[PDB]
Amino acid sequence: MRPSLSDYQHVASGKVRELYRVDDEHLLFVATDRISAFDFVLDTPIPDKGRILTAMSVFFFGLLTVPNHLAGPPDDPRIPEEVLGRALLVRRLDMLPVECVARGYLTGSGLLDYQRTGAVCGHVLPQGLGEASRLDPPLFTPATKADIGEHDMNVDFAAVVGLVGAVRANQLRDETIKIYTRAAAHALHKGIILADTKFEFGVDIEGNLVLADEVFTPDSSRYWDAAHYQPGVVQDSFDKQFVRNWLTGPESGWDRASTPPPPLPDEVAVATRERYIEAYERISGLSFSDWIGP
Numbered sequence: 096m097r098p099s100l101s102d103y104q105h106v107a108s109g110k111v112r113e114l115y116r117v118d119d120e121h122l123l124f125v126a127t128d129r130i131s132a133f134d135f136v137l138d139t140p141i142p143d144k145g146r147i148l149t150a151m152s153v154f155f156f157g158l159l160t161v162p163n164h165l166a167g168p169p170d171d172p173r174i175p176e177e178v179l180g181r182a183l184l185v186r187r188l189d190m191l192p193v194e195c196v197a198r199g200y201l202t203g204s205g206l207l208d209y210q211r212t213g214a215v216c217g218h219v220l221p222q223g224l225g226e227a228s229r230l231d232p233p234l235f236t237p238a239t240k241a242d243i244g245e246h247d248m249n250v251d252f253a254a255v256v257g258l259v260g261a262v263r264a265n266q267l268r269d270e271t272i273k274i275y276t277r278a279a280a281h282a283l284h285k286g287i288i289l290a291d292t293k294f295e296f297g298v299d300i301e302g303n304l305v306l307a308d309e310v311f312t313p314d315s316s317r318y319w320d321a322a323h324y325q326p327g328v329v330q331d332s333f334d335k336q337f338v339r340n341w342l343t344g345p346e347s348g349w350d351r352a353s354t355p356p357p358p359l360p361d362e363v364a365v366a367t368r369e370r371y372i373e374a375y376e377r378i379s380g381l382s383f384s385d386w387i388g389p
């Protein structure tokens with residue numbers, strides 16, 4: 096007899112996730128089956144996507160030695176049946192207002208900042224880099240949230256200091272790079288490049304830094320197939336390239352430059368689910384058929 100989701104108070108919504116209050120010290124972190132492409136939440140859900148990404152996140156939390164916000168098992172009785180397998184019970188933290196990003200490779204807004212200025216978030220880089228260039232060491236490229244529907248804004252280290260304090264800023268930088276390095280090496284051993292990743296942290300009652308997000312999902316991180324890694328061109332999205340190709344192809348009737356995109360073919364949604372499962376099983380060495388559900 097699990098509680099109903101309606102027993103809990105909705106406190107936040109993101110593009111493809113939701114957050115509920117369970118009691119004064121706990122929340123329910125819910126992944127949905129919604130998928131985003133080209134900054135649009137698409138009309139068509141991906142079956143099992145919320146469960147697969149939750150499974151991925153749980154695997155990576157277990158791999159990392161840093162404190163995290165998980166407060167119970169994936170089958171915790173406080174989790175409603177409706178969201179079983181795609182929701183986790185978590186401890187309430189005081190969240191730090193920094194999107195902590197690590198980049199092991201140069202792409203997206205990092206590449207654009209470099210092409211415009213020669214630097215990214217305060218880091219002056221070597222000349223001659225380009226799309227999907229490897230960065231060593233990985234860069235800490237923090238960002239801040241903007242208005243609803245707007246992209247996060249890249250900021251430099253001084254901005255992080257101004258937001259959270261000098262010592263805490265150093266801690267965020269160091270932990271973000273350490274965590275990314277560990278996860279990226281694990282994934283690469285399994286044939287997947289984690290090109291970059293985005294974390295949020297919070298602080299507990301005792302002042303301790305706690306990892307408090309989904310971690311190393313394909314929504315929070317760029318997944319690439321290592322076997323096809325080719326510096327100098329845009330890498331395929333391991334999980335979303337079918338979706339991107341169909342939307343921008345001749346069958347969609349949609350022009351990306353002009354705006355809400357049409358629904359996806361059922362076949363594209365099913366193929367996409369397969370890509371998520373493939374990524375999960377390769378990285379975790381586990382079978383998704385063993386992951387809990389309703």
Ligand SMILES: N#Cc1c(N)ncnc1-c1cnn(Cc2cccc(F)c2)c1
Nearest residue numbers: 107108109112113114164186187188307
């Ligand atoms: N995680 C976490 C968390 C925590 N453990 N304690 C306090 N606050 C948060 C918290 C508040 N906003 N978010 C972002 C977010 C996440 C998931 C779904 C959403 F809609 C929005 C995270």
